[PDB]
RNA sequence: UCCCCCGUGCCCAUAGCGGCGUGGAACCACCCGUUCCCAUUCCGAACACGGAAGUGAAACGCGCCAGCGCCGAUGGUACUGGGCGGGCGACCGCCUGGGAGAGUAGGUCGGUGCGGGGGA
RNA sequence: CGAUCAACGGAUAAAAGUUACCCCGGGGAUAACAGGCUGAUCUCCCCCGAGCGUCCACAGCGGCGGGGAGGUUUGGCACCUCGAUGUCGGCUCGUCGCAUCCUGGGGCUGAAGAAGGUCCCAAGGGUUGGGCUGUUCGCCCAUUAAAGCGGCACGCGAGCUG
RNA sequence: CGCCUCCUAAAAGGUAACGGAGGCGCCCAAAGGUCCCCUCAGGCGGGACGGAAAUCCGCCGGAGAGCGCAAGGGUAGAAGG
RNA sequence: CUGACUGGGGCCUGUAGAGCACUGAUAGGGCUAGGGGGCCCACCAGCCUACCAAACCCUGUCAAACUCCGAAGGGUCCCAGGUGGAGCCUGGGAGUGAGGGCGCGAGCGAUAACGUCCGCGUCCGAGCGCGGGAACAACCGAGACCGCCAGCUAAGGCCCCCAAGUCUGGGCUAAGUGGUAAAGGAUGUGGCGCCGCGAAGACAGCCAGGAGGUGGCUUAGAAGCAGCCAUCCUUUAAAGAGUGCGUAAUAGCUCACUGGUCGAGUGGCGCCGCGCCGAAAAUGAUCGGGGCUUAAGCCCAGCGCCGAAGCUGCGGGUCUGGG
């Protein structure tokens, strides 16, 4: 018995896996935003972000869109450059939206 | 006294094409099936028809993944 | 049909086929032993197809026979009965002038014609029930 | 007589005898069974048959259990007709019966009883039969 | 009450010559041990048509060893009607689930009145210690009519047995007898032709 | 490199059902609101945003339990590639090599990869 | 774009019957007769013993089912024969089988006797004349010890009949 | 009489008979493309007209529904709404 | 050198078998809708079941078009062995496109056909050349280049026809079974194995008794042989309220039974052997014949031999290859 919530989230994501690019996956809990861009051919993390670990603080949106600026500088670092956006669960607006704005600013590629 | 049957259609010569460990080439028709009995794994593309051609030139894997479903892949060279 | 009582017969049609009506026997005649009822025929070629039809004609004169034997009994019986002197002969009579409704078996005559020529009348049977007794009975 | 009340098919191929039963070959109801020796097609006429044999035997009284069932069609071709044209029809319902399945068993009788019932029965069936009696290796079962 | 039968260690011996040699092939086992064995057929079934799986057979081995075991299968040859193999189920001092006969003591009233009694279960499975094995197990069936039942649940279970099947598992029933009267109507009796389940645009 | 939690993968029920117990510092959830973005064929249930007074009740995580589900030997057999025989046949045996399924003993209330936050 | 070219790889744009008045080329690659293989059907004999037979399963019977025999029926197959194997019935002449119609011997009998029933042995000989019909078959008349059943290319047309 | 599905087909493919069973000669301007969102049948209990079955509420539920039509394969981690 | 075939390794599959998780089938229980029949009722509720009977469950089963399962095998690829009247590639020339028997797998048929239609194989076809099978295209043996008055074998055989043992060891069968068949029947006969019953003397014969209450649902007058319902008990063996003659009245004989006798084993399963009945068709019979009985039959174990156009020896021909 899966739920509306699980469905959504590997309808979306199975899609993305298809096109073999690096996943940017997006975790959203009610206070924090997460972003892990992820090598699902190795099964690896390579690059992390979260406002969690950078203290982050005041209002949601713009905090997830420095997130998502942190997530591109570390990456770029590391030659990451194209990359596809794992949406999970969310739709792409607000939080997860200003995340994704972010890591676009940042020179990440999608 | 006379029948109402004797009517069958065309084998189809459905089936896996090529096996695991073979040498194909890109476009090379991997199976024939009618839905999905195997699923289009790494490097290989699904027709309309559910057929599975190689992608790219490699060698056939297949793989058992359970209630996930067989798939096939090809490995490049 | 059953078959303890069937003496079948067979041998060889008569007329036209050519060489197979000569040696081909194919004439199925049949012969119900209690009843006598001899049902026979060469229609079709095979004797099996002839078998079909000798069969079912043999039922329609064992069920035409015996159904003649029991309506053949029953109008022996009813004529006896009703009796062809419905004129004026055997049971009983119903006056309306003065009620009396008697019965000439026996003889007891009574004015229960309201009582009887109105309604039931399962007692003033009883005489002509118990007088039927004694008439047996004694003798 | 038995005969199924539907089925999926009219017509049933014929198929083979091989082998002994696939199971039922130990006595599982009543106190002694009528085992087969020999592989057949045995029809619902055989059954019945063998079946009111033991009934009015035992007269009143005791337990028939009928183990074997005729779900298969049997067909034939009217008489005189050639070959093709089709499938014959539909005659009757066959049991298939191989070496070792009980195909009937008693209970509610004496031994003797239960000896000269499966026999008589024994006696309407197309092949040869044994009796036997519940025994641990039963049970085991 | 309890029974004794000599038993073998075999290796590679063929189980077809074995039993060409009267011996009956077998395996003894529990969660510590597994070996495969050898028995007298003649001698075991001596010892099987009594003990069944529901008494203790104890197996005298040639190292001197001597191990308490229940029969816990047996391999029928489907043709002949004569075992090929049994297993032993070496038992410890574990509780152990088991068979225990059953004994239907009195004459139903049903029985009585002309009706037979099935007896649908002629044992009852059980959780039980070893040092703890019944015999039997008395139930009264003198109380039932044609038709009646009785269930595992009616059982009285003697101290240590734990019942291993469902309450509701019924275990004896009186039916009505077999009857030459009722002859008469079932050959007189017509059936329906069977009817084919419709296949396609008729379903 | 150890323990807890949050993500996300792999094995594809030995991982599930049920029952019980446990956890809110942190995390996660409910939760508070519905101004704003966004939303309901009605409904802030959901989706979404702004929040942090409360609660681990639900959900989720972590334990324990074998009633169910799942897994499941070892023996032996069926069947059989090849080789032979027997029977008038329906069919039955032998040799050599392979070898089930059902059942039995038993097994299981998961294991593991990466990256986070926390703890020693 | 125009196809029930649906006999769906679709001979013409355009097409049905009859021949006993018949013809040729072929085939035993393929039917009808006979044989053959088979034995479903046919005949006969067994197995079981439900029940009948006032009583009594088996004098005589034998519910439902079971196993055979034969190769006389009608079929199945298409194997020799279509550069020919003449077919029904009758006549003539037989010969053989025995599952025996008579006669001879015998067992049981619900065998008193006489006459029967049934079963065993037995194939030596015998097994009538007529009416009807092309008939085989069958019905009928008058008899009889009896008025047997089958095989032989349903014996027999280089023997006849037609 | 052509075409499809299943079987006979002897675990690759293929495989005959006047063998066993069913369908096709259409359909859809959305019943198509792409984004987003949603999950069925059935069973039990509750519920005005209102029932076996309209709609509503709750619990149980891996797919036995649905997928335009035959059958098969496939399928809710959608191909279905 | 890539072939058929073979070794290893990977993968593909849903058959045999088996199973009942699905589709259906399914007997017998349980449990329980729905009806049915019976109660009490119509006040609408209320009770019975051994009638039928959905689901569900248990026990037990069935299936080409059912599968939770699932072989042996097969297919295909890779590396290897494999130099063969092998393989690939391109051209020239065909013939064939009526097949048949056998073994196995099925369908059709009737678990008929020297039947029919497929699959795998095989042989005939074309090996109607050779040995065996009495004779006989396809069963067994075996692929004939020619010559030999040499040898070794194959199937099959070794008493005579008729080449080779009237060979050797232990059995079985009296039916000429062998030398032509089924259900089923039967103290034929021969083995094993395993239970009963057996010292207050058995089975079989002689001997003495073998009774008393003596009637019932009870009657077509028969307590006991008349149809049932009957099965109590006793005169200090303890002898039926009854199996065979008289009976819509009785005798009397008889067993089961008890004792007395004379002086030694008896019955039942199960596996196996070999025989018996069941067993009737048409020109004259017969296993090929003659003939065969501790076999000249059958089973087991042995040594030897005969036996072909197979193999060897010897000589020759021709082609190909290698010198
Ligand atoms: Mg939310
Ligand atoms: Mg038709
Ligand atoms: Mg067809
Ligand atoms: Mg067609
Ligand atoms: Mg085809
Ligand atoms: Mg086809
Ligand atoms: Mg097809
Ligand atoms: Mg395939
Ligand atoms: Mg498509
Ligand atoms: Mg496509
Ligand atoms: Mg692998
Ligand atoms: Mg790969
Ligand atoms: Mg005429
Ligand atoms: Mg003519
Ligand atoms: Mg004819
Ligand atoms: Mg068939
Ligand atoms: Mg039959
Ligand atoms: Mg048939
Ligand atoms: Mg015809
Ligand atoms: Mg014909
Ligand atoms: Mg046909
Ligand atoms: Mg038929
Ligand atoms: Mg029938
Ligand atoms: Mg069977
Ligand atoms: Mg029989
Ligand atoms: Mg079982
Ligand atoms: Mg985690
Ligand atoms: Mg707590
Ligand atoms: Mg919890
Ligand atoms: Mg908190
Ligand atoms: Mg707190
Ligand atoms: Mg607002
Ligand atoms: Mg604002
Ligand atoms: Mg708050
Ligand atoms: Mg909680
Ligand atoms: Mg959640
Ligand atoms: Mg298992
Ligand atoms: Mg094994
Ligand atoms: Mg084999
Ligand atoms: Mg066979
Ligand atoms: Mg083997
Ligand atoms: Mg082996
Ligand atoms: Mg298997
Ligand atoms: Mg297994
Ligand atoms: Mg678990
Ligand atoms: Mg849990
Ligand atoms: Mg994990
Ligand atoms: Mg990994
Ligand atoms: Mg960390
Ligand atoms: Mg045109
Ligand atoms: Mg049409
Ligand atoms: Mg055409
Ligand atoms: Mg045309
Ligand atoms: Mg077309
Ligand atoms: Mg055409
Ligand atoms: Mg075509
Ligand atoms: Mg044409
Ligand atoms: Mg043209
Ligand atoms: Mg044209
Ligand atoms: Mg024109
Ligand atoms: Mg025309
Ligand atoms: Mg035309
Ligand atoms: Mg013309
Ligand atoms: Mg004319
Ligand atoms: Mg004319
Ligand atoms: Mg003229
Ligand atoms: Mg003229
Ligand atoms: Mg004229
Ligand atoms: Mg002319
Ligand atoms: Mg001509
Ligand atoms: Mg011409
Ligand atoms: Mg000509
Ligand atoms: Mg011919
Ligand atoms: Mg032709
Ligand atoms: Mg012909
Ligand atoms: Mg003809
Ligand atoms: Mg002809
Ligand atoms: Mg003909
Ligand atoms: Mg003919
Ligand atoms: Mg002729
Ligand atoms: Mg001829
Ligand atoms: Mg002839
Ligand atoms: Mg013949
Ligand atoms: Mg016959
Ligand atoms: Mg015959
Ligand atoms: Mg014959
Ligand atoms: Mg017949
Ligand atoms: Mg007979
Ligand atoms: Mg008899
Ligand atoms: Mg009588
Ligand atoms: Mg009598
Ligand atoms: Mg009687
Ligand atoms: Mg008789
Ligand atoms: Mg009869
Ligand atoms: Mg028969
Ligand atoms: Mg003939
Ligand atoms: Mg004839
Ligand atoms: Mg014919
Ligand atoms: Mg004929
Ligand atoms: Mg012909
Ligand atoms: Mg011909
Ligand atoms: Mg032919
Ligand atoms: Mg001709
Ligand atoms: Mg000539
Ligand atoms: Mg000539
Ligand atoms: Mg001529
Ligand atoms: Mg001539
Ligand atoms: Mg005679
Ligand atoms: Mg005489
Ligand atoms: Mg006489
Ligand atoms: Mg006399
Ligand atoms: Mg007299
Ligand atoms: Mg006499
Ligand atoms: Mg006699
Ligand atoms: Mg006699
Ligand atoms: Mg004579
Ligand atoms: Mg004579
Ligand atoms: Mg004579
Ligand atoms: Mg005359
Ligand atoms: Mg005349
Ligand atoms: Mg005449
Ligand atoms: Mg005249
Ligand atoms: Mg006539
Ligand atoms: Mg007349
Ligand atoms: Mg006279
Ligand atoms: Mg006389
Ligand atoms: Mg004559
Ligand atoms: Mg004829
Ligand atoms: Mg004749
Ligand atoms: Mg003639
Ligand atoms: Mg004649
Ligand atoms: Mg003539
Ligand atoms: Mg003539
Ligand atoms: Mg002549
Ligand atoms: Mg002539
Ligand atoms: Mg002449
Ligand atoms: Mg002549
Ligand atoms: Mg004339
Ligand atoms: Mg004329
Ligand atoms: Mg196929
Ligand atoms: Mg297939
Ligand atoms: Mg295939
Ligand atoms: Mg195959
Ligand atoms: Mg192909
Ligand atoms: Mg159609
Ligand atoms: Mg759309
Ligand atoms: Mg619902
Ligand atoms: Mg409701
Ligand atoms: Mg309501
Ligand atoms: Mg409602
Ligand atoms: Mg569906
Ligand atoms: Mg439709
Ligand atoms: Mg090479
Ligand atoms: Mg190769
Ligand atoms: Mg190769
Ligand atoms: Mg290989
Ligand atoms: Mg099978
Ligand atoms: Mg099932
Ligand atoms: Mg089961
Ligand atoms: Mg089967
Ligand atoms: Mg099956
Ligand atoms: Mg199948
Ligand atoms: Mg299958
Ligand atoms: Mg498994
Ligand atoms: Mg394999
Ligand atoms: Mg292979
Ligand atoms: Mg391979
Ligand atoms: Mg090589
Ligand atoms: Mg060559
Ligand atoms: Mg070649
Ligand atoms: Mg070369
Ligand atoms: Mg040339
Ligand atoms: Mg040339
Ligand atoms: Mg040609
Ligand atoms: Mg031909
Ligand atoms: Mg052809
Ligand atoms: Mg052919
Ligand atoms: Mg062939
Ligand atoms: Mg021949
Ligand atoms: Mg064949
Ligand atoms: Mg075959
Ligand atoms: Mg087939
Ligand atoms: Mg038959
Ligand atoms: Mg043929
Ligand atoms: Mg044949
Ligand atoms: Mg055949
Ligand atoms: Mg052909
Ligand atoms: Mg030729
Ligand atoms: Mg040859
Ligand atoms: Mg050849
Ligand atoms: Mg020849
Ligand atoms: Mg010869
Ligand atoms: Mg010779
Ligand atoms: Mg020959
Ligand atoms: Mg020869
Ligand atoms: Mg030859
Ligand atoms: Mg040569
Ligand atoms: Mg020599
Ligand atoms: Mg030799
Ligand atoms: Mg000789
Ligand atoms: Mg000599
Ligand atoms: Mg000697
Ligand atoms: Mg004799
Ligand atoms: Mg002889
Ligand atoms: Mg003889
Ligand atoms: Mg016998
Ligand atoms: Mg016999
Ligand atoms: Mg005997
Ligand atoms: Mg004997
Ligand atoms: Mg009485
Ligand atoms: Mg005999
Ligand atoms: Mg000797
Ligand atoms: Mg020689
Ligand atoms: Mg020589
Ligand atoms: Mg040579
Ligand atoms: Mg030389
Ligand atoms: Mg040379
Ligand atoms: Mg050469």
Same mark, same amino acid.
């Given at each position: 018995?899966?739920?509306?919530?699980?469905?959504?989230?590997?309808?979306?994501?199975?899609?993305?896996?298809?096109?073999?690019?690096?996943?940017?996956?997006?975790?959203?809990?009610?206070?924090? /935003?997460?972003?892990?861009?992820?090598? %699902?051919?190795?099964?690896?993390?390579?690059?992390?972000?979260?406002? +969690?670990?950078?203290?982050?603080?005041?209002?949601?949106?713009?905090?997830?869109?420095? *997130?998502?600026?942190?997530?591109?500088?570390?990456?770029?670092?590391?030659?990451?450059?194209?990359?596809?956006?794992?949406?999970?669960?969310?739709?792409?607006?607000?939080?997860?939206?200003?995340?994704?704005?972010?890591?676009?600013?940042?020179?990440?590629?999608? | 006294?006379?029948?109402?049957?004797?009517?069958?259609?065309?084998?189809?010569?459905?089936?896996?094409?090529?096996?695991?460990?073979?040498?194909?080439?890109?476009?090379? /028709?991997?199976?024939?099936?009618?839905?999905?009995?195997?699923?289009?794994?790494?490097?290989?593309?699904?027709?309309?028809?559910?057929?599975?051609?190689?992608?790219?030139?490699?060698?056939?894997?297949?793989?058992?993944?359970?209630?996930?479903?067989?798939? !096939?892949?090809?490995?490049?060279? | /049909?059953?078959?303890?009582?069937?003496?079948?017969?067979?041998? =060889?049609?008569?007329?036209?086929?050519?060489?197979? !009506?000569?040696?081909?026997?194919?004439?199925?005649? /049949?012969?119900?032993?209690?009843?006598?009822?001899?049902?026979?025929?060469? %229609?079709?070629?095979?004797?099996?197809?002839?078998?079909?039809?000798?069969?079912?004609?043999?039922?329609?004169?064992?069920?035409?026979?015996?159904?003649?034997?029991?309506?053949?009994?029953?109008?022996?019986?009813?004529?006896?009965? +009703?009796?062809?002197?419905?004129?004026?002969?055997?049971?009983?009579?119903?006056?309306?002038?003065?009620?009396?409704?008697?019965?000439?078996?026996?003889?007891?005559?009574?004015? =229960?014609?309201?009582?009887?020529?109105?309604?039931?009348?399962?007692?003033?049977?009883?005489?002509?029930?118990?007088?039927?007794?004694?008439?047996? +009975?004694?003798? | 007589?038995?005969?199924?009340?539907?089925?999926?098919?009219?017509?049933?191929?014929?198929?083979?005898?091989?082998?002994?039963?696939?199971?039922?070959?130990?006595?599982?109801?009543?106190?002694?069974?009528?085992?087969?020796?020999?592989?057949?097609?045995?029809?619902?006429?055989?059954?019945?048959?063998?079946?009111?044999?033991?009934?009015?035997?035992?007269?009143?009284?005791?337990?028939?259990?009928?183990?074997?069932?005729? %779900?298969?069609?049997?067909?034939?071709?009217?008489?005189?007709?050639?070959?093709?044209?089709?499938?014959?029809?539909?005659?009757?319902?066959?049991?298939?019966?191989?070496?070792?399945?009980?195909?009937?068993?008693?209970?509610? *009788?004496?031994?003797?009883?239960?000896?000269?019932?499966?026999?008589?029965?024994?006696?309407?069936?197309?092949?040869?039969?044994?009796?036997?009696?519940?025994?641990?290796?039963?049970?085991?079962? | 009450?309890?029974?004794?039968?000599?038993?073998?260690?075999?290796?590679?011996?063929?189980?077809?010559?074995?039993?060409?040699?009267?011996?009956?092939?077998?395996?003894?086992?529990?969660?510590?041990?597994?070996?495969?064995?050898?028995?007298? +057929?003649?001698?075991?079934?001596?010892?099987?048509?009594?003990?069944?799986?529901?008494? !203790?057979?104890?197996?005298?081995?040639?190292?001197?060893?001597?191990?308490?075991?229940?029969?816990?299968?047996?391999?029928?040859?489907?043709?002949?009607?004569?075992?090929?193999? !049994? %297993?032993?189920?070496?038992?410890?001092?574990?509780?152990?689930?088991?068979?225990?006969?059953?004994?239907?003591?009195?004459?139903?009233?049903?029985?009585?009145?002309?009706?037979?009694?099935?007896?649908?279960?002629?044992?009852?499975?059980?959780?039980?210690?070893?040092?703890?094995?019944?015999?039997?197990?008395?139930?009264?069936?003198?109380?039932?009519?044609?038709?009646?039942?009785?269930?595992?649940?009616?059982?009285?279970?003697?101290?240590?047995?734990?019942?291993?099947?469902?309450?509701?598992?019924?275990?004896?029933?009186?039916?009505?007898?077999?009857?030459?009267?009722?002859?008469?109507?079932?050959?007189?009796?017509?059936?329906?032709?069977?009817?084919?389940?419709?296949?396609?645009?008729?379903?």
């Amino acid at each position: 018995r899966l739920t509306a919530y699980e469905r959504r989230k590997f309808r979306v994501r199975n899609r993305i896996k298809r096109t073999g690019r690096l996943r940017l996956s997006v975790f959203r809990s009610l206070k924090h /935003i997460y972003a892990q861009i992820i090598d %699902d051919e190795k099964g690896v993390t390579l690059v992390s972000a979260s406002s +969690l670990a950078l203290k982050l603080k005041g209002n949601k949106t713009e905090v997830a869109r420095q *997130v998502g600026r942190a997530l591109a500088e570390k990456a770029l670092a590391l030659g990451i450059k194209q990359v596809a956006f794992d949406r999970g669960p969310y739709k792409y607006h607000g939080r997860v939206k200003a995340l994704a704005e972010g890591a676009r600013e940042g020179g990440l590629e999608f | 006294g006379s029948t109402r049957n004797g009517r069958d259609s065309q084998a189809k010569r459905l089936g896996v094409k090529r096996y695991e460990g073979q040498v194909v080439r890109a476009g090379n /028709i991997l199976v024939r099936q009618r839905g999905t009995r195997f699923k289009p794994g790494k490097n290989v593309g699904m027709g309309r028809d559910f057929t599975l051609f190689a992608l790219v030139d490699g060698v056939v894997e297949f793989q058992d993944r359970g209630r996930l479903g067989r798939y !096939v892949h090809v490995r490049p060279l | /049909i059953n078959p303890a009582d069937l003496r079948i017969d067979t041998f =060889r049609s008569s007329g036209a086929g050519g060489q197979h !009506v000569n040696t081909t026997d194919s004439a199925i005649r /049949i012969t119900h032993l209690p009843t006598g009822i001899v049902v026979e025929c060469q %229609d079709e070629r095979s004797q099996h197809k002839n078998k079909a039809k000798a069969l079912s004609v043999l039922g329609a004169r064992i069920h035409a026979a015996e159904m003649a034997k029991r309506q053949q009994a029953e109008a022996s019986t009813r004529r006896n009965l +009703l009796g062809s002197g419905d004129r004026s002969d055997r049971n009983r009579t119903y006056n309306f002038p003065q009620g009396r409704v008697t019965d000439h078996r026996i003889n007891l005559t009574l004015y =229960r014609l309201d009582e009887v020529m109105e309604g039931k009348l399962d007692m003033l049977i009883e005489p002509i029930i118990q007088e039927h007794q004694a008439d047996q +009975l004694a003798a | 007589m038995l005969m199924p009340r539907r089925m999926k098919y009219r017509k049933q191929q014929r198929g083979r005898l091989k082998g002994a039963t696939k199971g039922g070959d130990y006595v599982a109801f009543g106190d002694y069974g009528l085992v087969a020796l020999e592989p057949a097609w045995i029809t619902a006429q055989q059954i019945e048959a063998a079946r009111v044999a033991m009934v009015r035997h035992f007269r009143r009284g005791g337990k028939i259990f009928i183990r074997i069932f005729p %779900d298969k069609p049997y067909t034939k071709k009217p008489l005189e007709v050639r070959m093709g044209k089709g499938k014959g029809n539909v005659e009757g319902y066959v049991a298939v019966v191989k070496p070792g399945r009980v195909m009937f068993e008693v209970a509610g *009788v004496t031994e003797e009883q239960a000896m000269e019932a499966l026999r008589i029965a024994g006696h309407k069936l197309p092949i040869k039969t044994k009796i036997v009696r519940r025994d641990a290796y039963d049970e085991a079962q | 009450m309890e029974y004794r039968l000599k038993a073998y260690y075999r290796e590679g011996e063929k189980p077809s010559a074995l039993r060409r040699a009267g011996k009956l092939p077998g395996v003894m086992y529990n969660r510590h041990l597994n070996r495969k064995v050898y028995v007298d +057929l003649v001698e075991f079934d001596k010892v099987f048509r009594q003990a069944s799986i529901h008494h !203790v057979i104890v197996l005298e081995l040639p190292d001197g060893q001597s191990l308490p075991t229940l029969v816990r299968q047996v391999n029928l040859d489907k043709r002949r009607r004569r075992p090929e193999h !049994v %297993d032993f189920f070496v038992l410890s001092d574990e509780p152990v689930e088991m068979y225990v006969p059953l004994r239907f003591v009195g004459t139903p009233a049903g029985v009585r009145a002309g009706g037979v009694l099935q007896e649908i279960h002629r044992d009852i499975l059980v959780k039980v210690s070893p040092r703890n094995i019944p015999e039997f197990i008395e139930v009264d069936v003198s109380g039932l009519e044609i038709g009646d039942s009785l269930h595992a649940s009616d059982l009285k279970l003697p101290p240590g047995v734990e019942l291993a099947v469902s309450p509701e598992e019924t275990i004896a029933a009186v039916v009505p007898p077999e009857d030459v009267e009722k002859l008469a109507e079932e050959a007189a009796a017509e059936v329906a032709e069977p009817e084919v389940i419709k296949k396609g645009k008729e379903e």
